[PDB]
């Protein structure tokens, strides 16, 4: 039983160091900054056609084409500017829960209850979308996936492990372990050297795509973490959980930075995404509304409240010109500001 | 501007295909099959087929020219509070429980409690299939094991007049079966106000009428939501 005591005492040492690394709270330093005020976002566009609840969507580098996955078995790539449906891919498994858009835009990834990551090519010679690869090896359902490039893909599964796969070989180049719970969501850093992941264990972990080891773990949450997203600078990230609380973690600080929660909010957070500048933190909630808070002052700045069901996915374009929200009403909604 | 017209035509074709896939999609009903290792749900799949780390298996069958898709979660960790939310829109949940195993008839009851009390499963009617009736009957008739050891209230329980035992059925086996049925029905009626209903059925793994019972249950469920939708209720 010596190892358990060693773990406990070294955890106490880590906590002592972290508190020693705590001089002032983010509220104290940011008390003098001008508040954002009220953010009134308008529904500029409404995308319809999905048969069932959307579970995931992702923007592209073009900031014009967006891929959305619905649990009816359809992966639809929409042209946001014109509302027209560009692609509609019928999936082999209906229970899709995640999808990704490659930075180059030539490939699209998806997955779900079936422990397979399906990669489809959008630039086929015949002009007909065909599945390019079916990565397999995970012992649990696929929860999230993101593209490092056209040949490397990072995915998370319910087996409590993440995996970096090389598409051409169809083999998992690296496996990431350490989570004791179901891996919910992963976010890639801007420089694609490190990525964070939340795995239902009241904690999030940082991983290296090249070394395949865990660097830091943050355990400020009280329940399962559902969504994770990187700060635009890549130096911090935000996590939402079923405890109806969002938390900001800075990698260097190695501890919680700010907590976003309110008494009237007693429902879990399903999605989280930062803006281009990172000042506004957008989160989707099970109460059928999306809340945008001040990343510094931590006060609620705006609410969308336009969906008839829980918000399942939230995304922001690379240029921050629009926000795409997909709920279980089978409708994505593009919101933008007005002046 | 010709490329714009081509894009509009492509969108029109995609919309036509999507509409064809919506007629097709509302023409079929989705079912979620849940159970434990003791439950013979795999045998149920291999018997209703008459009509790899895959993760999930799909079984498509047809009754009265109505297509039913059943999904069995195959390769997932024992934790299930997350992916279960994927089935918040299925037509029904077929829960298979071994009535001939008392040591784990309480774990199954807890699982049923969780399913019934789940926020995302408040609107899904659960089809309760009390499987392996022959094993339970033989176990009760042998007398080696007593239900009272695991459920003391069984001593006070008495067979209700609503029971319709099969001919030649012993009083004791009927009493045990209906005690289990009422144990499940207590949790079923503990929560839920006309949103989702439980249908207890005395079924065995080797039976050709399970598909018909599921079809009737789906008919009743669709009828109830049509009553609600059409403002009749």
């Amino acid at each position, epitope marked *: 039983d010596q190892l358990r005591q060693e773990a406990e005492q070294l955890k106490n040492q880590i906590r002592d160091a972290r508190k020693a690394c705590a001089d002032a709270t983010l509220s104290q330093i940011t008390n003098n900054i001008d508040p954002v005020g009220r953010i009134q976002m308008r529904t500029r566009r409404t995308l319809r056609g999905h048969l069932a609840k959307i579970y995931a969507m992702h923007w592209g580098t073009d900031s014009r084409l967006l891929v959305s996955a619905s649990q009816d078995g359809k992966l639809i790539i929409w042209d946001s500017y014109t509302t027209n449906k560009v692609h509609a891919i019928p999936l082999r498994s209906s229970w899709v829960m995640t999808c990704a858009y490659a930075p180059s835009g030539n490939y699209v990834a998806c997955g779900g209850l079936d422990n397979i990551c399906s990669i489809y090519n959008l630039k086929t010679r015949e002009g007909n979308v065909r599945v390019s690869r079916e990565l397999a090896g995970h012992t649990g359902y696929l929860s999230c996936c993101r593209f490092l490039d056209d040949n490397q893909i990072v995915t998370s599964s319910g087996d409590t492990t993440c995996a970096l796969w090389d598409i051409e070989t169809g083999q998992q180049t690296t496996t990431f372990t350490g989570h004791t719970g179901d891996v919910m969501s992963l976010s890639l850093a801007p420089d694609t050297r490190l990525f964070v992941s939340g795995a239902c*264990d009241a904690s999030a972990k940082l991983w290296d795509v090249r070394e395949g080891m865990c660097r830091q773990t943050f355990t400020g949450h009280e329940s*399962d973490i559902n969504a994770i997203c990187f700060f635009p600078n890549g130096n911090a990230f935000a996590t939402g959980s079923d*405890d109806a609380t969002c938390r900001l973690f800075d990698l260097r600080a190695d501890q919680e930075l700010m907590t976003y929660s309110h008494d009237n909010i007693i429902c*879990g957070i399903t999605s989280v995404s930062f803006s281009k500048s990172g000042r506004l933190l957008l989160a989707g909630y099970d109460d059928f509304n999306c809340n945008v808070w001040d990343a510094l002052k931590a006060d609620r700045a705006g609410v969308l409240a336009g969906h008839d069901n829980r918000v399942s996915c939230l995304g922001v374009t690379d240029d921050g010109m629009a926000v795409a929200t997909g709920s279980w009403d089978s409708f994505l909604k593009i919101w933008n500001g007005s002046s | 501007s010709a490329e714009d017209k081509a894009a509009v035509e492509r969108s029109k074709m995609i919309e036509k295909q999507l509409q064809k896939d919506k007629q097709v999609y509302r023409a079929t009903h989705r079912l979620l099959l849940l159970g434990a290792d003791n439950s013979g749900k795999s045998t149920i799949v291999k018997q209703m087929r008459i009509y790899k780390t895959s993760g999930i298996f799909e079984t498509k069958f047809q009754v009265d020219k109505v297509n039913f898709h059943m999904f069995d979660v195959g390769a997932q960790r024992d934790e299930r509070r997350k992916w279960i939310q994927c089935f918040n829109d299925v037509t029904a949940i077929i829960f298979v429980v071994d009535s001939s195993d008392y040591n784990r008839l309480q774990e199954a009851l807890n699982d049923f409690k969780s399913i019934w009390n789940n926020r995302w499963l408040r609107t899904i009617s659960v089809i309760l299939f009390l499987n392996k009736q022959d094993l339970l009957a033989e176990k009760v008739l042998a007398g080696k094991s007593k239900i009272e050891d695991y459920f003391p209230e069984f001593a006070r329980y008495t067979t209700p007049e609503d029971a319709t035992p099969e001919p030649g059925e012993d009083p004791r086996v009927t009493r045990a079966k209906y005690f289990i049925r009422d144990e499940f029905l207590r949790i079923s009626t503990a929560s839920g106000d006309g949103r989702h209903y439980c249908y207890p059925h005395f079924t065995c793994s080797v039976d050709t009428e399970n598909a018909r019972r599921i079809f009737n249950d789906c008919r009743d469920i669709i009828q109830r939501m049509h009553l609600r939708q059409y403002e009749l209720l």
Partner: nanobody
Amino acid sequence: QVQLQESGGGLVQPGGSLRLSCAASGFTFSNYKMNWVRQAPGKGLEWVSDISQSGASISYTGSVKGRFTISRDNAKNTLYLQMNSLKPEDTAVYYCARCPAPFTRDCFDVTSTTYAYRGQGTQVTV
């Protein structure tokens, strides 16, 4: 951060009484439904009892319905399980489990292996 440490237990002859405590840290004890589970040597994680947030709702298993009692203290943020009239077959490792999400009546995975929000457990021998 989320910790659930169990205290008490030991070698007690049949027919005795034992009060086991659950100390909770890293979360709001008043907003979570609590459960007591057991694992006997060579057996699976058997559920024992559950208590709601306010304590107005309480449930047990048949084997311990008339024997065990459960209580909670939100002021101290702790759980209490009092066993009376112990039996030889009660020897096991008893864990103190928290439900996944707050403000819910659903406790789905409190018996699953490698559960994150379950305590280390306390040994009871009889």
